[PDB]
Amino acid sequence: GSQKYEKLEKIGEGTYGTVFKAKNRETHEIVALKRVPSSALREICLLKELKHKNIVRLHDVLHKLTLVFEFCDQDLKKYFDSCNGDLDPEIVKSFLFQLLKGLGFCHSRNVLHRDLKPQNLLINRNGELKLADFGLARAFGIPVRSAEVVTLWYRPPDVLFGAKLYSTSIDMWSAGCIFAELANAGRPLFPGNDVDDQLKRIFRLLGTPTEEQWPSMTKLPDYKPYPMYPATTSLVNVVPKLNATGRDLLQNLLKCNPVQRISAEEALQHPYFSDF
Ligand SMILES: NS(=O)(=O)c1cc(-c2nc3ccccc3s2)cs1
């Protein structure tokens, strides 16, 4: 059963516990093991139905509850640490393409991830990217239980303003943040100190949304009127290594109003991926 696996090292933290690199004692296969709740039950329920090359594979469940996953050598945070500077623009494109393919697959099946960040993206030695950690995910946008939301830096303006409900638009904002991070050698786009600082960094770059751009903004549970910062002329200053077509895609992912954010399917059709 559980003792069939030898724990090798602690590799992470999920939404509900610790992740270990482990070895199957009978076969010597290397796996990622999560030992432990609603987050575990939800992850099993979703992953039994979400099979895609850009989604982490759930191999087995042992009953203590043990979840046996596919092993990847790094998460994107570790990948960035090892890159220690600019990523090759082709790797930037490949990793974004794969992330959007995985997200596209989820969204077409009415699943939003809700916890998209570099620690939840796995990178294997063949340059393949996988989405992991579906413990906060929602099916049909239905809340399962909770204040539990994605870490501050990847939170969209609607969520920062207290929206409790959202569509797959939540993941497209996080994808835009990760795209800027990929293009910037792992440097975060909006590394806010708290909610107020997060909203200020977002609006200072993109501009504070007008009534015309976002009519319902004023109705949000935690809405606060911010200074009307102008929309920065170009993203060339924040993503210097990203070409003009890349920056156009980035702008379409980073719309403050959730309804205006490009979908994963539309992003995959963007000219950025022309020669791919
Ligand atoms: N932090 S790290 O050592 O680069 C690293 C983390 C991982 C993870 N694998 C999985 C699999 C499933 C769920 C979460 C994680 S986190 C694989 S390598």
HEC string of 7-43 equals EEEEEEECCCCEEEEEEECCCCCEEEEEECCHHHHHH
User: What is the spatial distance between Cα 51 and Cα 193, in angstroms, rounded to a whole number?
Assistant: 37
User: What is the spatial distance between Cα 140 and Cα 167, in angstroms, rounded to a whole number?
Assistant: 8
Running DSSP on this structure, what letter comes out for residue 48? T
**Can you tell me which atom of ligand 1 is nearest the CA of 75?**
4
User: What is the spatial distance between Cα 52 and Cα 58, in angstroms, rounded to a whole number?
Assistant: 11
Resolution in A: 1.9
Question: Residues with Cβ < 8 Å from 79, sequence gap 6 or more?
Answer: 123
HEC string of 89-158 equals HHHHHHHHHHHHHHHHHHHHCCEECCCCCHHHEEECCCCCEEECCCCCCEECCCCCCCCCCCCHHHCCHH
Annotated binding site for ATP: 11-19, 34
User: What is the spatial distance between Cα 130 and Cα 122, in angstroms, rounded to a whole number?
Assistant: 5
Whether the CB of 75 sits within 6 Å of ligand 1:
yes
Whether the CB of 118 sits within 6 Å of ligand 1:
no
User: What is the spatial distance between Cα 95 and Cα 182, in angstroms, rounded to a whole number?
Assistant: 8
User: What is the spatial distance between Cα 46 and Cα 31, in angstroms, rounded to a whole number?
Assistant: 19
Whether the CB of 11 sits within 6 Å of ligand 1:
yes
**Can you tell me which atom of ligand 1 is nearest the CA of 73?**
18
CA separation, residue 224 to residues 24, 157, 161, 214, 219 (Å):
53, 11, 8, 14, 10
In the reported structure, the alpha carbon of residue 30 is separated from the centroid of ligand 1 by a whole-number distance in angstroms of: 12
Best mutation site among 19, 56, 128, 129 for ligand 1 pocket (most ligand atoms within 8 Å of CB): 19
Ligand 1, atom 10, lies closest to the CA of 32
Whether the CB of 272 sits within 6 Å of ligand 1:
no
Running DSSP on this structure, what letter comes out for residue 164? S
Structural domains in the chain, CATH included, are 1-73 (3.30.200.20), 74-272 (1.10.510.10)
Sign of CA dihedral 181, 202, 130, 26: positive
Would residue 88 show up in a list of annotated catalytic residues for this protein? no
Residue 255 burial (10 A CB sphere; 0-12, 13-18, 19+): buried
Whether the CB of 133 sits within 6 Å of ligand 1:
yes
CA quadruple 153, 73, 98, 109: dihedral, nearest 10: -80
**Maximum CA extent, the chain:** 63
Running DSSP on this structure, what letter comes out for residue 219? G
Instruction: Give the helix/strand (H/E) hosting 200.
Output: helix 195-206
Annotated binding site: 11-19, 34
Report whether 124 contacts 130 (CB < 8 A): yes
Of the residues 115, 133, 158, 171, only one is catalytic, namely 115
